[PDB]
Amino acid sequence: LPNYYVSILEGSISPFNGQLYNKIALTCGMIHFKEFFNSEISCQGLLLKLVMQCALPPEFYFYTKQVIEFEETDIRNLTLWERTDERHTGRVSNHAELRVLSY
Amino acid sequence: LGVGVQGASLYCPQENYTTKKQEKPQWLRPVDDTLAEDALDLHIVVKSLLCDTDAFFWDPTVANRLDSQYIQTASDLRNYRDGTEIIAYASGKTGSVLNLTRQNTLHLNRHNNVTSIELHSPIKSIKIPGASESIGRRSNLVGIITENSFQIFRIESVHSRSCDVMVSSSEPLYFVEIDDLQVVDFAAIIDIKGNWSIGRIPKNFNNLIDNLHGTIFDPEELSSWKRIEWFSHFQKILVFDRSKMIEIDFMNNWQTEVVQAKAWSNIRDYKRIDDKNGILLTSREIIIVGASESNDPVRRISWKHDLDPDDTTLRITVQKVKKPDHILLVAFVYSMRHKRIYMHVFSHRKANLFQSLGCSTVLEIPGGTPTGIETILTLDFELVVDFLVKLRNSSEVYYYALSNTVDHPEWASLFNNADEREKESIGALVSQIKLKERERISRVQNLIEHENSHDEDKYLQDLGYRLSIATNELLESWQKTKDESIHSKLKNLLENSDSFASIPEFSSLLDQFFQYYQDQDVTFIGFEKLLHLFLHEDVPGLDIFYNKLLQCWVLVSPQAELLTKEIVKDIIWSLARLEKPSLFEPIQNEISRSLSGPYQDIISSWDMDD
DNA sequence: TGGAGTACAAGTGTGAGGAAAAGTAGTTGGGACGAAAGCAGTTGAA
DNA sequence: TTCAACTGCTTTCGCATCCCAACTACTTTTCCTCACACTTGTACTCCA
């Protein structure tokens, strides 16, 4: 294999600055994740993970579930976001797991 | 006088077993390596306050913003007094306002009055020359360096009845040539970017350059860091860039290049140790304590230590420790990029027997990086030593003693709007949840009121019935739509999975629901072989999964139970993907895609090889 | 009780950057068993 | 009638200048990941 064909193949540097999230969206623009897979984040697990990170009183688990209900389109079923129109990044930061990081 | 020298140079480097032996056959450790022998030396900070007030590069011309040393004024000559300690630091807005005694630790005095002499130029260096013991007295005059001029201050009759230091000043000479000067030292003797001259200090403040000057100007050194020091009282000077040290004696016309540091290192800092023989140089890659020679006071290049860190912004300060048998020279290098010090211990005896002991490192405050570190002279085996630091990006100065024996406002400036009509309009939501939670602590409390009832055994017999026929409703679409050639929700029922009050029963009930579907188009993913991802251990069950959280959330919750119950009642309904078909459905979707791609992607798609 | 100016963000083209393991750039090392005899036609000068 | 060089012969078998290489450099082969300048409305009041 050629050297630039294998320097891409051997992982040197880790995915950084949202390089992983862009490659999710670039893949979902190539093949559509909708109408065959469920773009559904188990956000109950993610908050329970984030409760178990910093040992908080678990009422903030029940609060944050209510908080996302206040501001979310189709309350559950969090949006995995394909992109094919632009090569730009989504400045709204429409990654659903990245959204819960603000919530 | 030990043996292993070059004459030109002299090494005791980093743990490489130094290069001499006399072989003194005297049964008294018959060897005199430059490496010495003792026990350890651990250092402990004594953290205390003293006083208060594009980014990918850094300015070399800015040097310090403070100073601290014992000064003996003009009226202490005739009277009995000997030595007063001062500290003069820049202040203000752009670093433009330059402004005392020791009880047991150095602290600001009683009347604690800042003597704010005012300037109109950025402060870029604040230093005294020091003193001499051949002159017998101490200097009472200090000079500072700014962008617009060069200034000299003269400290006259420090007061003891009022703790107020009245200060006098000389003429601030502006620039005849428009070139930013760098370093002052006296032992207006200054170094401009590329050339130097000798300045004359007057006796009369009630109302310059001499006729001799020199230059070191290099067309291929690029930086703006120079430095000057007088060497060994002969009125020899030492001039620096980042590439060579030139020795110049203006008594005659005599100029010698001594250090040439272009090839693998660079000159970084140069402190003149109050010892009028020994003086310490910080190169890159090596620490040099090159002293003065008794035959010709030119340079006794003494035992130097190979320091390890590679950096572009290293400084040094040194403190002598005078013992009656020998003289120590602890050397403290510090950087502007991180938060560490690095030390080394030297010793000196009568026969120019410079030695070396070892190295250690300690840390600093987490907010900022150090930018100015100075040792208090302390008026002059359990080594004690004390000094002050100053960190960059904070205008505080603390005091430290060493004995032998993270909040950012940027996260604060992201919340907290000043909108009082929007204050409770935001704040209603924190009071809205005061309602919604108390219902949930009380409604499942009504399920706490009941304990394995037949009335709720009926409620769970009704549960699976609308899970069986709902599956039998969700199965019968996929068989007819199976010829798609190009999973589900399990939240279809919104009547139940809210008020069921047993974890071991519903775990069995779904296992009771698992056993029912022996048929095709229906498979599952087992929870107990997958529920361990939160506890990060071996969790083989759903019933012991509660038993881990049962001991876990005891203290931090009022009554601690149904909240812990409801989340365990949530997660199995949070992974509500139990609607896989049989094996047939993705396997028939494997074969369709390779037909659609060409015969070039046939050989490209082969799993399971070795 | 409509219009004149105008910053905040939704939204659209231009090249510029990043990395590696392959190859190629100048010096120095190094490759190479023979100091035999009486004798004769030509040939020295007398 | 002689001096001085040209002269073939001692045994009897078998033994016996051109090329290469070294190490460290610098470079090319390309493929992958995003930004930087432009623009219309909308928003907050602006002067009528």
Swiss-Prot record, chain A:
UniProt region (C-terminal cyclin fold), positions on chain: 5-103
Domain of life: Eukaryota
Signal sequence annotation: none
Subcellular location: Nucleus, Nucleolus
Record's comment describing the protein's domains: Although it shares weak sequence similarity with SUA7/TFIIB, displays a similar subdomain organization as SUA7/TFIIB, with a N-terminal zinc finger, a connecting region (composed of B-reader and B-linker regions), followed by 2 cyclin folds.
Role according to the record: Component of RNA polymerase I core factor complex (CF) that acts as a SUA7/TFIIB-like factor and plays a key role in multiple steps during transcription initiation such as pre-initiation complex (PIC) assembly and postpolymerase recruitment events in polymerase I (Pol I) transcription. Binds rDNA promoters and plays a role in Pol I recruitment. After binding of UAF (upstream activation factor) to an upstream element of the promoter, CF is recruited in a SPT15/TBP-dependent manner to form a pre-initiation complex.
Additional facts recorded: Present with 398 molecules/cell in log phase SD medium.
Subunit structure as annotated in this protein's UniProt entry: Component of the core factor (CF) complex, which consists of RRN6, RRN7 and RRN11. The CF heterotrimer may further dimerize to form a hexamer. RRN7 interacts with RRN6, RRN11, SPT15 and RRN9.
Family to which the UniProt record says this protein belongs: Belongs to the RRN7/TAF1B family.
Stated name of the protein: RNA polymerase I-specific transcription initiation factor RRN7
Species name: Saccharomyces cerevisiae (strain ATCC 204508 / S288c)
Gene that this sequence comes from: RRN7
UniProtKB/Swiss-Prot annotation, chain B:
GO cellular component: cytoplasm; nucleus; RNA polymerase I core factor complex
Protein name: RNA polymerase I-specific transcription initiation factor RRN6
GO molecular function, one term: RNA polymerase I general transcription initiation factor binding
Subcellular location: Cytoplasm; Nucleus, Nucleolus
Keywords: Cytoplasm, Nucleus, Transcription, Transcription regulation
Description of how the protein assembles with itself and partners: Component of the core factor (CF) complex, which consists of RRN6, RRN7 and RRN11. The CF heterotrimer may further dimerize to form a hexamer. RRN6 interacts with RRN7, RRN11 and RRN9.
GO BP annotations, alphabetical order: nucleolar large rRNA transcription by RNA polymerase I; transcription initiation at RNA polymerase I promoter
Pfam families listed in its UniProt record: Rrn6_beta-prop, Rrn6_HB, Rrn6_K-rich
Chief subcellular location: cytoplasm
Chain ranges passing through the membrane: none
Misc: Present with 237 molecules/cell in log phase SD medium.
PANTHER family: RNA POLYMERASE I-SPECIFIC TRANSCRIPTION INITIATION FACTOR RRN6
Species annotation: Saccharomyces cerevisiae (strain ATCC 204508 / S288c) (Baker's yeast)
Function according to Swiss-Prot or TrEMBL: Acts as a component of the core factor (CF) complex which is essential for the initiation of rDNA transcription by RNA polymerase I. After binding of UAF (upstream activation factor) to an upstream element of the promoter, CF is recruited in a SPT15/TBP-dependent manner to form a preinitiation complex.
